[PDB]
Amino acid sequence: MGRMLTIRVFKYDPQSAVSKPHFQEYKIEEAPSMTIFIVLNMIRETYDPDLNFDFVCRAGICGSCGMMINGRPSLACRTLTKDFEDGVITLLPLPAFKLIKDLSVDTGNWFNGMSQRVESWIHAQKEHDISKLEERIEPEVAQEVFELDRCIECGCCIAACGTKIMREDFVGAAGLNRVVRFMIDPHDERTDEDYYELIGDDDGVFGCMTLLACHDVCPKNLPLQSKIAYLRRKMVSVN
Amino acid sequence: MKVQYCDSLVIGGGLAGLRAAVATQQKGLSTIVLSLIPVKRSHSAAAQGGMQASLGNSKMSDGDNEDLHFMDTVKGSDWGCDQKVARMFVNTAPKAIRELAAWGVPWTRIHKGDRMAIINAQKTTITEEDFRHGLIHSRDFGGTKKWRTCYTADATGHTMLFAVANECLKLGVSIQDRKEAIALIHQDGKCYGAVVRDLVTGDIIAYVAKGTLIATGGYGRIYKNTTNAVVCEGTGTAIALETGIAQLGNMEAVQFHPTPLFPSGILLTEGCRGDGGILRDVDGHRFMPDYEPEKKELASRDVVSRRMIEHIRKGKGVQSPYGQHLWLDISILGRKHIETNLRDVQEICEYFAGIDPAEKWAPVLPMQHYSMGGIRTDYRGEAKLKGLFSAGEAACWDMHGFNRLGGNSVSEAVVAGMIVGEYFAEHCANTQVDLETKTLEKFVKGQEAYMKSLVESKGTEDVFKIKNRMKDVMDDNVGIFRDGPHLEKSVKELEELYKKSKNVGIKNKRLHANPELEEAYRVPMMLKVALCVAKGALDRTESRGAHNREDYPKRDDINWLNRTLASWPNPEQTLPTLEYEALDVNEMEIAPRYRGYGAKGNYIENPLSVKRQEEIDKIQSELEAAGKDRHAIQEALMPYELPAKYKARNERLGD
Amino acid sequence: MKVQYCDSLVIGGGLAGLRAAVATQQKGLSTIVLSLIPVKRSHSAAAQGGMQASL
Amino acid sequence: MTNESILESYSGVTPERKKSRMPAKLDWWQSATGLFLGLFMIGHMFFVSTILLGDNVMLWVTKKFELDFIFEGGKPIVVSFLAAFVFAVFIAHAFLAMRKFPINYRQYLTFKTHKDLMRHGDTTLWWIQAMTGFAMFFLGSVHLYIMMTQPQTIGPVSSSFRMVSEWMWPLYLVLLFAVELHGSVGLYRLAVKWGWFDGETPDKTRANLKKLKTLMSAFLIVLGLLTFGAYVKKGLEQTDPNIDYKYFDYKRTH
Amino acid sequence: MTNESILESYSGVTPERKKSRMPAKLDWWQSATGLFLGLFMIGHMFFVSTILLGDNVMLWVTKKFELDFIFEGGKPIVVSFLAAFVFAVFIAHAFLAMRKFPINYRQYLTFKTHKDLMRHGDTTLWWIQAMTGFAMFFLGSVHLYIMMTQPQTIGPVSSSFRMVSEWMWPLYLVLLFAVELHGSVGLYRLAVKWGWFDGETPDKTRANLKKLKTLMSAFLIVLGLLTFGAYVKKGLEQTDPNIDYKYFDYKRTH
């Protein structure tokens, strides 16, 4: 508040032949409840309309604004400048994703491919009649499926993962969590063996080095640590 | 030239667009879904209240059916909706919930036992029998007597959107994000596709299809204060308008929400899950009981918004750098029991408002929330432009009239996706189109030239201040309370704003990944949408649903029992052309009367309403005497259409 | 139905087809070359005698 | 090679058209060898620190160490077989765990930069695991071979001889911190990796495990750092050029 | 880290927008360290086989080895510094060349199957390079540390003591074939890799180089296999329990 903030932003246009990666600094006056969302829009409308970034809900619910904020993958719309003592904030695009420009990366299409790779949809032999009563489900089970279904595909756990940064084909924490989400859903008939055919290799669960950065950075606080281990124990004893 | 072809083109990756894509793709029609952003980030993902559907599972849902849901919808619409469309909706909602359940949506379920509170007064303990255990639960939302709002804990829109998007991936629907439809290709009154701009590369591409469906959401962002995502700017509405043939319906019908966080607009679902939130003014005074002695804070959200504005104009509002607001106090709770999930709102306030709800009060002010208005279609979802369909908030299918029922909009998105999806598929499979390269090239090169002129423009106007000026005008003059004098001035300034938008100049000259270029062509579009809303509001001299004219406080069923149709025939005109579509009282199952909320006897009665009412009363009493069921009586009062796939009845607990 | 559009469609990836594709593509016409096999394996590759031209 | 081996290489799948179970088995054995070595080093620290309980006690454990009842004499040949086994697991573990190293410039630069930007504990501790593991390729091999070829030189004075006289203290000093950091962090990660104790509150469990790790490791380095001084002291005392410290002889050598 | 380091990690390019020159430098140093060690081992085989020219001669080279004029006495401290240097290059080489190992199940299975189907000399010889290189992680480290910490134990009888008495012959026997196969094949590949002698008829050159390799290696193993027996013989002769073979003392120890 009244405090002068130093915002350092990574800039680079891979589609421009004359663009070189560099940092650009901006000087903005802090205001109460100020978020990175507000900071970037101020810069856009009054200092530099060139800068690329992606915002949608600005309510921490859509997973669009992930970026490296002072070294940590976080949702820019829920990040308060107030929490940075130095008054110096450095913004980098999320690593491990294809860069579009500056702070904008292609997060959506990687997740879509991931969703297809683990076949992120209900697998059932028969199609239930939608004009009849729903199949009953224990409220406890519906609750635990929901917990894992809360993933907003923000990509923070992917960018946070040193393994994924070194090894591109790694399915990532988000992928391992998606598998478990269906594993514990009674509507899905796949067996442990079916899941093994999906992530039972070095690009899957066995490629995880348990760095746990995914768990410690998940803005949704999903139980990644225990859920991934759960999956590892399960996959290691398939055949 | 670059051309992409598909049998069914869907513009918009929200619940409506994705569900429609499933309908077409499942029948072998090649389909493409275009979206500004990855589809799972659409505004639909923000829905936390729930979805309305008459399942009749829980104790508080007992005895619920299509008729009761239909009544709430019609009366809520303040008789501005197409009642037949509402029937198609309520009858199909139950099956939408159930289909999503089969698709994995983790709906909160009912468990045997007793629950406390969650009631205005009197009773306070609810008992769920054993035969209800395991079925889809429901909560109190939207103010309906019967609790029928289904939910997946606190992220209903999110789980629903993800399931429908996953189904699209399963079927191999072609999802192309960061792609924007900037114009519709049409000839001889027929739509053959859209001209698309690749937001990343800047390429202008023609997407041709036998049928095109627009499910682009609302246009809340023309207002400064809104709960809508940053992408709900109404460009889908605009490109439809710019064809000079497709028409927009009831653009002036905008709904506000009483308690979004001020000034962010972030939704605080406070006072929902468990009634307790208390509204206070600048003196800490609980004012709602002063205006609504009986209902108090639990009055109709429609009423709460008005009272909040009234109280502020009475000089009892809180001053701040961003304007005036009021207070929302939930600390009066800050604790309870357990046995289920109940903890979220605090985080919203801490992460953004920077405070603990259980301690300090949250600043709030009514803000734009939903867009009843949209592209005008028939009951099948087809616009006046043949081959162009629309579904969801982007449409004016019109099951909402002048006031959407809480929980009905996320429900319409999926339901319309199912129904319009069927008609859209049928159209795409049966129609035959003549794709002329001469016409394709005209539209494509026309947009390329347009992009070039924007980048080369030596104009001195600043696109951002013009867009911000527009949002202020809309908020100040086209809000909860409106009057001719101010609407007159806003329309005038908007028109002036529109002319200046054409003299904009931008700094960044590149054609690819250019945020500034994006605003340069989107703002003029938003201004045309704003003009339709403002002008529609000025010419509508009556008060109906969410549209309140202080100079015409009554609902006029004699001169305004109709729908506003906006068009833009001459690409050079600066004001929309408005026409009216009258609502036939004889084609109504429920004649106009008291809407059920707000002041009593506040509407000019139409002689025909009384005539039709008597006929209804008569037709019912008779058939009821002959021992005819509600299904036969409904059909005798107002028959409606439904595609084969969904004309089955909905089984309920205890049939 | 699956449909692909281009301004100039060339059927055959031999010397004639590829050279014609160059002519159209160099003037901004989107062009597709269809071939049974990778174009560099076309029969044109077997010519060992030479090309006639009055230099 | 075998036909099934050829079919899997060329098809990327099994003759039954399924993904190989080898990656799962390799993951299992990597952890199994790591666990063994981890526990082993714990006991090793106790028996090696017995010198603190007096030359007599250390002499006792040594003699009674690995088959002593079958032959009261000695038979240090058992220590060699024991050292051989441990060496084998050491190699197998190194072989398997080696797959996890950053393997090229990009992976290295890229991971290092991430580590420094993140300042995330468990990620940094993995770097240490990798670094300490690489160093032990050279450090551990030395100690393991000698221990396998000269088991009759283990004792209060014999060990102290090699420690000081033969200049093994530099290696031991470095190897101490190396294997300790490596083993304790590895045991911790192994717990969260397989979630053996997750229970109902995995977050509290992890917090506890991290606290335990620091305590256990703090205790081990200090103890091993004291045991270090022990042998070093006795080694600096050894002066008589006529005393055969290395092969000092009691009943069955020393 | 540094800003340039961050920009390169995130952009995959240099601040000047060019690809890093690091991969080129790393390739250079990998070969440079390999070359050094390769030549070094050649000389090493000569001086180590001097024992065949008589205990006197071997004693001579040893004493006159590394600074002897500055101090006629001895100063084995130089052998330690020399061993330290070689150890450093040994580690650097291992670090760099390690990047070339198959690193996972797929690469391993896949490459092994290819090797067996191909039956191609130079491809198979690379496998041996990799295999022998991995083994030396443990074998070479032992010899190098001892040689750096006990330089005063090098001599006709002192070395023979460690060879037989301390049981180093098993390691030396295995390490002999290991480093020889590794070094000779590596020197050969190094020649064709950089093409220093390609000339006008590279195919004839390569054929010659492959012939030379086999001859040079045949000569080295036989010589080193004879030198092996040399130290082993003198070691089996050592019996007097009153003789301090290890630290045998001439003027300046032994």
Ligand SMILES: *Cc1cc2c(cc1C)nc1c(=O)[nH]c(=O)nc-1n2C[C@H](O)[C@H](O)[C@H](O)COP(=O)(O)OP(=O)(O)OC[C@H]1O[C@@H](n2cnc3c(N)ncnc32)[C@H](O)[C@@H]1O
């Ligand atoms: C804002 C809001 C709304 C809301 C709610 C909470 C909030 C914060 N809670 C609700 C609730 O509890 N119950 C309910 O019934 N409704 C609730 N709502 C409103 C409701 O969520 C919406 O009406 C509904 O989700 C709308 O769905 P729809 O499918 O129509 O649209 P969408 O999700 O907004 O997605 C629009 C898509 O269109 C793409 N787009 C837009 N313009 C273009 C152009 N020009 N070109 C290409 N694509 C375009 C967007 O990218 C998006 O995918």
Ligand SMILES: *Cc1cc2c(cc1C)nc1c(=O)[nH]c(=O)nc-1n2C[C@H](O)[C@H](O)[C@H](O)COP(=O)(O)OP(=O)(O)OC[C@H]1O[C@@H](n2cnc3c(N)ncnc32)[C@H](O)[C@@H]1O
């Ligand atoms: C056979 C031959 C010909 C020849 C010659 C030596 C041999 C063995 N030496 C010549 C020489 O020294 N001097 C000379 O002037 N001519 C010589 N010739 C004949 C000459 O090479 C040919 O006439 C010339 O190369 C023909 O070129 P063209 O571009 O016309 O055709 P092409 O190279 O055969 O390639 C045909 C392509 O068509 C594709 N294809 C065919 N059918 C289809 C269908 N149905 N759909 C899609 N693609 C199709 C082929 O795949 C190929 O790419």
Ligand code: HEM
């Ligand atoms: C030759 C030297 C060694 C090398 C090359 C080495 C290397 C490694 C590496 C890089 C890892 C990480 C594996 C992963 O992330 O999946 C690891 C883990 C581990 N190591 Fe070692 N190691 C060596 C010696 C030892 C020793 C002597 C011990 C005994 C203290 C040991 C105990 C462990 C443990 C407990 C793990 C956990 C294994 C797992 O996570 O599955 N290591 N080692």
Ligand code: HEM
């Ligand atoms: C095969 C079983 C092993 C045996 C028989 C053994 C035995 C011993 C003995 C007797 C000592 C005392 C000093 C000496 O004799 O020189 C010692 C010290 C030491 N050993 Fe081992 N060891 C074994 C395996 C290992 C392994 C696998 C490592 C690590 C890779 C290791 C690391 C150390 C260290 C660092 C010390 C120093 C103790 C201190 O200063 O606290 N040992 N060992």
Ligand code: HEM
């Ligand atoms: C710590 C043990 C060692 C390891 C891990 C090792 C590993 C390797 C590997 C895997 C290669 C293949 C590199 C490639 O294909 O690019 C290589 C090449 C080579 N090594 Fe070693 N090495 C070791 C010790 C030695 C020693 C002691 C010598 C001396 C005889 C040596 C001399 C060479 C030579 C001449 C090359 C050729 C380098 C090149 O092609 O650039 N290495 N080594």
Ligand code: HEM
């Ligand atoms: C730092 C320089 C080196 C010195 C001072 C040195 C010295 C010696 C000496 C004196 C011997 C005779 C026996 C003994 O003393 O135990 C020997 C044998 C041996 N050294 Fe080294 N060495 C060095 C480096 C290496 C390296 C780098 C390797 C391989 C990685 C190696 C491999 C061998 C082998 C295999 C023998 C056996 C000779 C035979 O039996 O033919 N040495 N070394």
Ligand SMILES: CCCCCCCCCCCCO[C@@H]1O[C@H](CO)[C@@H](O[C@H]2O[C@H](CO)[C@@H](O)[C@H](O)[C@H]2O)[C@H](O)[C@H]1O
């Ligand atoms: C911590 C243990 C490491 C595990 C071993 C396996 C991974 C590392 C080796 C394989 C990858 C090769 O990694 C490459 O090594 C050279 C070292 O000469 C590094 O070189 C860089 O760091 C070294 C060390 O701080 C500096 O002296 C050097 O000036 C600098 O340019 C490269 O940036 C790195 O990318």
Ligand SMILES: CCCCCCCCCCCCO[C@@H]1O[C@H](CO)[C@@H](O[C@H]2O[C@H](CO)[C@@H](O)[C@H](O)[C@H]2O)[C@H](O)[C@H]1O
């Ligand atoms: C020759 C030197 C090797 C260089 C070292 C780096 C590459 C090799 C290690 C990394 C890849 C891991 O490689 C993996 O190892 C295990 C050994 O337990 C092999 O396992 C297979 O071969 C071993 C050895 O013949 C058999 O005892 C075993 O029954 C068989 O299943 C896997 O098929 C291989 O894919």
Ligand SMILES: O=C(O)/C=C/C(=O)O
């Ligand atoms: O009050 C809410 O959270 C949502 C309301 C909606 O249905 O629009």
Ligand code: SF4
């Ligand atoms: S698991 Fe967590 S961090 Fe990873 S994508 Fe989902 S919500 Fe984001």
Ligand code: F3S
């Ligand atoms: S950070 Fe990566 S290594 Fe595994 S524990 Fe999480 S996915």
Ligand code: FES
């Ligand atoms: S903008 Fe949606 S989570 Fe940040």
Ligand SMILES: [Ca+2]
């Ligand atoms: Ca609408």
